[PDB]
Design a protein around this nucleic acid. Sequence first.
RNA 1: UAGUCCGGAUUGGAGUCUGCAACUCGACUCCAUGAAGUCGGAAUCGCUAGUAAUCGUGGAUCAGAAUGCCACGGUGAAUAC
RNA 2: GCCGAGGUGGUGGAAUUGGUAGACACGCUACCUUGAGGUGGUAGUGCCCAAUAGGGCUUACGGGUUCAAGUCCCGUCCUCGGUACCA
RNA 3: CUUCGU
RNA 4: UGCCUGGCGGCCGUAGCGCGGUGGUCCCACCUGACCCCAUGCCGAACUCAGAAGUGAAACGCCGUAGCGCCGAUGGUAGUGUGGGGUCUCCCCAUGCGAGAGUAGGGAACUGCCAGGCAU
RNA 5: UCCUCCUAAAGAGUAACGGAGGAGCACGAAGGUUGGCUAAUCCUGGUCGGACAUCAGGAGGUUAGUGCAAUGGCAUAAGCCAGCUUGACUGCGAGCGUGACGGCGCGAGCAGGUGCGAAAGCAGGUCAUAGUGAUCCGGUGGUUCUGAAUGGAAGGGCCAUC
RNA 6: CCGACUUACCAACCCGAUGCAAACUGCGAAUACCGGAGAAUGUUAUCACGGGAGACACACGGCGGGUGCUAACGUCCGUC
Lengths: 116, 65, 75, 177, 50, 136
Amino acid sequence: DKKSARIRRATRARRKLQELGATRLVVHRTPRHIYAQVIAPNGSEVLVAASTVEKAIAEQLKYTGNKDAAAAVGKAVAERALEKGIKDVSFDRSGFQYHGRVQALADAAREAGLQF
Amino acid sequence: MKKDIHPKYEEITASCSCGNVMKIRSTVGHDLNLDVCSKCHPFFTGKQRDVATGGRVDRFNKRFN
Amino acid sequence: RNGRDSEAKRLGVKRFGGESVLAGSIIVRQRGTKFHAGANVGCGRDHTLFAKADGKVKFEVKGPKNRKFISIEAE
Amino acid sequence: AKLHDYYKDEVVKKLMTEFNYNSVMQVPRVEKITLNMGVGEAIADKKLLDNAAADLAAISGQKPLITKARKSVAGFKIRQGYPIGCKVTLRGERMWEFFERLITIAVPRIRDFRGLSAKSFDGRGNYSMGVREQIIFPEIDYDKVDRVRGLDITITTTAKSDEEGRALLAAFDFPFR
Amino acid sequence: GIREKIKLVSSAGTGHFYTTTKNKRTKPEKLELKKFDPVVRQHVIYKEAK
Amino acid sequence: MLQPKRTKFRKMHKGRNRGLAQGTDVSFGSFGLKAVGRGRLTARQIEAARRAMTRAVKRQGKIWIRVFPDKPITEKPLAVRMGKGKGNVEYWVALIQPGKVLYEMDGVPEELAREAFKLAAAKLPIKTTFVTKTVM
RNA sequence: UAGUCCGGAUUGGAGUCUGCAACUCGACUCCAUGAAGUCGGAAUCGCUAGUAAUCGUGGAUCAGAAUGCCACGGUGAAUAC
RNA sequence: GCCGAGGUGGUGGAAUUGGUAGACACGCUACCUUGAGGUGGUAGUGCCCAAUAGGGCUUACGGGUUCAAGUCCCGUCCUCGGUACCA
RNA sequence: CUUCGU
RNA sequence: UGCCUGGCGGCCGUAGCGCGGUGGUCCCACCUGACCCCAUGCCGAACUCAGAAGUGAAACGCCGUAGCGCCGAUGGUAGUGUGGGGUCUCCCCAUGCGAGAGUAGGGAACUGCCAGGCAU
RNA sequence: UCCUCCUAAAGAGUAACGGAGGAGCACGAAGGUUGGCUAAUCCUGGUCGGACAUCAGGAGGUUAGUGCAAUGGCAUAAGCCAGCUUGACUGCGAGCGUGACGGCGCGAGCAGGUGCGAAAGCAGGUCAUAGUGAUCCGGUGGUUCUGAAUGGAAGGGCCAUC
RNA sequence: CCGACUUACCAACCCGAUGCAAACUGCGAAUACCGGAGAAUGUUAUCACGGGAGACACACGGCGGGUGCUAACGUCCGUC
């Protein structure tokens, strides 16, 4: 209902990123947490994942479900992506509106050197 | 809610006639006076008072002896 | 009263499966989308499916709706 | 507001004690109240709809929506997309305010109110009642009489059946002849 | 054919116009329509004419 | 007569009567008149056979007509040349293949069914047979 | 200056009186109700002075039952070339 | 047999640019004038239901389009007009 | 304009 | 390695409905409040933000059940390429291919990477 | 003359005075792009309100809708709503499809200049297929390309267009 | 105004049992057609360019059909 509606809003742009062959930065948002993965252009393997449910990111934050947790996970996923070296990724907002916490994570990855 | 399209919603104190007072948020613009409220109404207490549904034999024994 | 018909539009599958297509070459001219566009296959405004890379044509049945797709192996 | 607190204490307690409810989220909570004003006379005149709009903006708190026609019917001389009604959705503290004003200061004033119908539950607990005169609400000056222009109010509840919704409503000492 | 046939002329570099069609009934207004002029090589405002 | 109320198109192609039947088994009644041979039955022959069979059993029991016409047969007028369009629809036939149970009945014994089915089969152009209801 | 403190039909309840008897079918009273009606189409009537118009009263018939009929007075015109 | 036109109140006839028909003129009904008819004047009127304001049914018949059909498409019935020639 | 029969 | 949970897929009903039971340490869902970002053609329902008091009610996941949907043989039949034949507006024969429906039956899916909690 | 279906015999094509229907347009939004949403029809409840108007909930799942006939398609919607807009842009164009030809159609990408979007991207009209006529002769505008001795011009050309 | 009591009757939607369809399809062949690879065969049989044509009234037989009357040595297609 609220879950199935978001899936098709994502499914519009997920198929386009499937056609273009882009490496996807897949964000996931929850009232308690935030999640970010970098998935390879095929879609069957991921490259790096970072989230607030990791202990290493959660222990440094006040709350794991706000804009600042989003910024910390965005910084961590950009730093870990360049720890592997994945320079040009393409952002998948996964059906969520961009501006709230997805914009914080996207601004954090854009400021820390993940070119999209 | 959007800013200017809605009318102003002021908290006023309406006064029932039997003695009840009731602060409500409404848009009338002023204080307001009432007559009947949730208390002191003929239905809400239990004085609903259906009429005699036939007082005919009682009328005959009252009229005639 | 009758006797009015139009001229045939020569539709149908032009490049069948396993054929070798150069880029830009038309695979299917169709009306709706009987066959959808897969990898390295474009869909025109005509809903004409053409080749965007050189390779072997492939027909597949993908999707949850059991619908057909035309892909190209880049050979 | 106050009836929200009366709910959260007394009505939640009562509906735990009369139905066996395993959880506090099993209780029926009242979701929204919609005030619809189906004017219908906007097929020729336009300003009468803009008067019924101010009517629902006075009776309710917020400004109404103007509901257009969903399909055209040649029986009624309406067309596809003519503004034939108006409506207000109110939820949260505003429906609790409106519900307390409805149950206390409005519902005695329905001009031989002999008790409204308890069979008007649709089947899933949602109750709907139609007032014929908008003068029962204290927001009307009566020096600015326009038309009779009644409305219908639909309390939408998260109850499952008729008897759970009627328990929730009559818990608020709702009239129910 | 009641939709009349108009040209729209560039504001500057006037050695080029576009041509299109316009219903004079429902829209009796001008058609501004900022388009591209390949003489100036920029996008300029355009103007309705008969 | 029998005829479809509001068929979809008024004229239809001739086509061929190739193949075998579909209503092979006696399903509604206990006795049946089954087509041995190929052909097509107009609605007049179907209704004439129904009248003869009903007069034979004197309206006792139940009689099912297991075939509907639903096929318009067009025919040109007299002294008209070939061409100038397809002719006007004049009757409605039912294409009857071998092994097609045309008629069924129940409520009557087998002997009056046998005599009634001779009296009905005399009206039809096709060769028929008498068949009884089987299990399995 | 409003269908209104106009109008008083209709209807509900409570009665009184005459009368063997008030349902069909009496008159009146009181309370409640508050309809049509804002001077009336083509047409058509009465009236020449204490008259028309307007206001009340009385009588006969009558157990009871007049907005009719027969009488009586109060005020009281306009116009006739 | 083909083409063209029309089928609308009790009647003669209008509305064929899709916006809930019968304009007009008869007839008929009620009233008035008349001794009484005729003419003449006033108010009516397509037919079902309620006592009203109303509501429904109404363009030969059947069905489709359309938000809506007297009007457009189509099938059949009937009435008119033209045509049905060359041997 | 007409005004049914004896 | 063994459970649970979440993200992206592979495959596209043996995979989906139904009926019943179950989960809350995390995770997720509902939830609390909306000072502020943002929001409604009215409405914090949705979108969004700030938070975890309460609950597993609904939703979702997992287990179970055949009432359906679904899959579905072997044999037969219909059709049919080719070469012949007749009692030829249809059929038959030699050979090659061989369904659709139905029946026996199967069946409440399987699984790749990543991450979290738990127990070993 | 053009478009859709059947005849048309599972590639394409295929005739008849064979069976059925349509077009000679519309739209600066009904085009572009971003974000969002998801029908018809029933049942129940509810002021006028009634079979059918608006409201709420359930059933149902695309039986709806597409500017217009039919077919094919369409939920990632091509269907529905809103913001900003003019890519309904100029020069090209690999390679294809389709015609005897005149022709007609699809097109990734490249150069210039844009619009939407945070971005990847998308856009050189519309869900696609109808909405249309060749050449001549002439009209308007721009361009020293030519310009009958020479410098101009008239007239031709070329481009846009009627 | 409630509204009850019964039948010569017509009967939607669902449910099961039956059929039919060129303009119906949740199924679906045999052939045909397109492409790729391999051996044998066939006087290159294939393609392109050039010189010269003729022909563009067809007929019948099998098989798939439209029309006709599943009439015609009928008519119009496809294929041999």
